[PDB]
Symmetry: C2
Subunit: 121 residues, 2 copies
């Protein structure tokens, strides 16, 4: 898997095999942050894990509580917050230059789908 930039309404996911240290990229339309291979692997794994936990929640016309689920590794921390049919995703990187990121509910499903298009790792 060579050099792909994916993008949509409010999100970006990129990968460059040739990059010596920072081959990954995640972002909204307006912000973006570079990631190491280890972090991009973790980003996908944990984003997909959270999405799947949430999708496994039985549906409800109007749930009483907002959901707040988190998954983390040594390299990053992720949090879903909102409702099963509309939740935000927050990211905080642990290493080197730290960055805090956030995707509105509107953008999340396309981003999650985008992470499956990195079929290596």
């Amino acid at each position: 898997m060579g050099r792909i930039l994916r993008e949509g309404a409010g999100w970006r996911l990129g990968w460059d095999e040739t990059a010596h240290r920072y081959p990954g990229l995640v972002g909204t339309t307006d912000w973006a942050v570079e990631l190491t291979a280890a972090e991009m692997a973790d980003f996908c794994r944990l984003v997909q894990q959270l999405a799947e936990t949430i999708a496994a929640i039985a549906p409800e016309l109007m749930p009483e509580e907002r959901l707040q689920i988190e998954a983390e590794s040594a390299l990053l921390w992720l949090e879903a917050e909102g409702f099963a049919d509309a939740y935000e995703l927050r990211l905080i990187l642990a290493s080197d230059r730290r960055v805090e990121a956030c995707w509105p509910a509107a953008a999340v499903p396309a981003l999650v789908a985008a992470t499956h298009t990195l079929k290596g790792f």
Copy 2:
């Protein structure tokens, strides 16, 4: 100047003297990125430079062209785009983990004012 976090509607600016490598912070309400001292010094200087160029433009009820001005150093690149009374600010860091950032026009004046409250450098 010790440990200050400033924040307002759509922006954050922070400084921690005690931090060994990344004492600076700039962000919107939802995204944030850490900066080295050299980069925070550059961020302020260049943001204030752009703001002042723009404020020195004679006013017009409805200008024919959108403005696009940039200032850069070895460490970062900044760009104002829009109109003198309402312009966006974009940032791209050059070193280490690179980050692309952007502040909507609404947030810019308070952020610019915030950079003057780092009266050392």
